[PDB]
Amino acid sequence: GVFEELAAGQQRKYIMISGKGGVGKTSLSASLAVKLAAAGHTTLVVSTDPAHSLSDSLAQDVSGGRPVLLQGTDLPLWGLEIDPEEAKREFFEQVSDFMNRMGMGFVIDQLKELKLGELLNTPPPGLDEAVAIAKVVQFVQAAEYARFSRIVFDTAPTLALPDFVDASLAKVIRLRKKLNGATSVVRGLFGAGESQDEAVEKLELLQQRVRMVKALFRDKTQTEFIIATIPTYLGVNESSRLLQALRAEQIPCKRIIVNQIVGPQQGDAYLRMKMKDQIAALEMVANDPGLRPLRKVIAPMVDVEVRGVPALSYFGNVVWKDVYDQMNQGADRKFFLLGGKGGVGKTSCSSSLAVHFANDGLPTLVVSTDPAHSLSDAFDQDLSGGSPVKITSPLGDELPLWGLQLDPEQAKAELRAVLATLDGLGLGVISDQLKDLQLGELLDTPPPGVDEAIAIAKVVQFLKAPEYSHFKRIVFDTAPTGHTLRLLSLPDFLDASIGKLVRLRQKLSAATAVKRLEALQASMEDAKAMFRNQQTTEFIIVTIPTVMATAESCRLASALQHEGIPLKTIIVNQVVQANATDKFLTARRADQARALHHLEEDTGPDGLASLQLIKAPLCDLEVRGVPALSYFGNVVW
Ligand SMILES: Nc1ncnc2c1ncn2[C@@H]1O[C@H](COP(=O)(O)OP(=O)(O)NP(=O)(O)O)[C@@H](O)[C@H]1O
Ligand SMILES: Nc1ncnc2c1ncn2[C@@H]1O[C@H](COP(=O)(O)OP(=O)(O)NP(=O)(O)O)[C@@H](O)[C@H]1O
Ligand SMILES: [Mg+2]
Ligand SMILES: [Mg+2]
């Protein structure tokens, strides 16, 4: 059948379970590894998890950086948990001053204090990932432990990265080559020796490894892919897009699995399942440390999805009205930032907050940093581009609302492009400007959630004649990600900026611009100036009754609380209600064969769509046990 081809041959096969965000990909890949080891393959299963996902989903601790065999079985199976932040840390890491006499002392001391050696020695971002897939081929080629018949990779959710690291490696590698024969003083600005031979020998190797992965993924004999997703519409929608990319960079992908599908027979169980959760979580939201001080709003699910202008107005009646809109008194201007992990509905909320704001007499702006065409699907107007769009699909009335979509990516490369004398001087010994601008950003990309923190700070500045005059309250719907940043990087990313605007200020003088970096300084500091502002601004976490995203939200709120940010509000958004439980099962099961259909027909048979379908039933297990897993395993494969 299906699993027959995955027990197929002696030829080593690397199965990739990949997908996004809590489909069960881990228990999916785990279960597979098990049923595969059962079959007789000496098999290794792999995750890149800081949190040790594979560890407690096996119930045996594999968290050792190198492959761990499992005690308690006669089965041939190995777990592997790889450390990204130590992947780079381990693999990557005469006096004639007659120059000072000519007066060079000033210019050499300014360039040395531009600390180029740092920019040269800073490892390119994302490295360890690309190297990780390679670390795997290493333990298994090495054959130190056993002769590995199959490998099962549970990937980090959702190919450009092996490239960008190769590129940022090549840039750095080419510039240590221009550095072996070089002047005494030139080698001195980088801290570099007279011989780069051993370094460049080693950096070259690393890059060959980074290359080996992009080579292996496309490799037609060993590699195979399997997409994992849940029955929701967007999951099928998204998965299609990832098969587009899969047929694109041309890595073989033969199977999509659907997990957490509800069996018509035993469905009545699932209802009680979800229920124990809602209670557990809600209970937690009640008593949780630090959750206590912030506003709580429990909203129920709704009759059906909110695609429209009136619907949002009424949603607003539910969330912000039946509970307190007394958040509206304050200064004349108000900022509200809603954020939440993906799946919790925070557009329908954020939108509705803006809509309830509109008719209330007050001009308001909703900002969508979500690329998804979210807010475009929200008011159903397709608000596109970067400029404000006036808000109408009413019967005729006062519409004091605008909203705009700022792609956080287009917002980054807009900033990168804007940053694209001393040019000649650096080129003075040899030509470096290309390589050092591009690597000037190799220090710039390292921030994690900042694609959007661009867009936000952009509009923060937008108070002005054309706008600040026009607007009273505004609201930020962040993208379904990490825009919520809970440690102190705010004064410190600002110090990255001022550190390098001051180094650059140092060496602009010694060539006989950077005011832009001063514009960014004021924008960031003005973005910061409102975020930490007590009166005008407040933050909101939108979340759901599943106890996982609950205790997560608690943490992220507990940390955001002591981070100082005025987060005044939580929202537990889709609460199923008991009296409606009958309808809700038939509802979420209705979604199923809808989206299941929307998959069964996607872009013909050929490009993308339907490949080979794997259905995995929802309930009900802890699913953390080894035999549990063999069970899950025999059920699906
Ligand atoms: N089909 C399923 N049947 C029963 N329990 C499931 C199923 N899928 C997931 N779970 C449970 O969901 C929890 C976490 O899901 P998991 O299988 O680890 O998803 P994942 O692959 O790790 N995705 P991610 O959240 O991005 O790491 C575990 O406690 C599992 O027991
Ligand atoms: N209280 C509710 N009752 C019923 N349906 C809801 C409720 N809240 C949200 N929804 C539905 O869930 C969806 C929420 O999607 P959205 O507002 O984009 O946030 P999201 O779930 O994180 N999606 P995305 O941003 O693309 O990752 C909407 O399409 C609504 O139809
Ligand atoms: Mg995982
Ligand atoms: Mg959203």
UniProtKB/Swiss-Prot annotation:
GO CC list: cytosol
SUPFAM superfamilies named among the record's database cross-references: P-loop containing nucleoside triphosphate hydrolases
Alphabetic keyword roster: ATP-binding, Cytoplasm, Hydrolase, Nucleotide-binding, Transport
UniProt-annotated catalytic positions: 49, 370
A GO molecular-function annotation: ATP hydrolysis activity
Principal place of residence: cytoplasm
InterPro entries: Anion-transp_ATPase-like_dom (IPR025723), ATPase_ArsA/GET3 (IPR016300), P-loop_NTPase (IPR027417)
Source superkingdom: Eukaryota
Keyword ATP-binding: yes
Knocked-out gene: effects: Small chloroplast and strong decrease in chlorophyll content. Defect in the accumulation of photosystem protein complexes. Defect in the accumulation of TOC34, an essential component of the outer chloroplast membrane translocon (TOC) complex, which, in turn, catalyzes the import of nucleus-encoded precursor polypeptides into the chloroplast.
Cell location: Cytoplasm, Cytosol
EC number: 3.6.-.-
Binding site for ATP: 20-27, 259, 341-348, 573
PANTHER family, per the entry: ARSENICAL PUMP-DRIVING ATPASE ARSENITE-TRANSLOCATING ATPASE, ATPASE GET3B
Similarity field: Belongs to the arsA ATPase family.
Oligomeric form and interacting partners: Monomer. Interacts with TOC34.
Biological role stated in the UniProt entry: ATPase required for the post-translational delivery of tail-anchored (TA) proteins to the chloroplast. Required for the accumulation of TOC34, an essential component of the outer chloroplast membrane translocon (TOC) complex. Recognizes and selectively binds the transmembrane domain of TA proteins in the cytosol. This complex then targets to chloroplast, where the tail-anchored protein is released for insertion. This process is regulated by ATP binding and hydrolysis.
Name of the protein this chain belongs to: ATPase ARSA1
Gene field: ARSA1
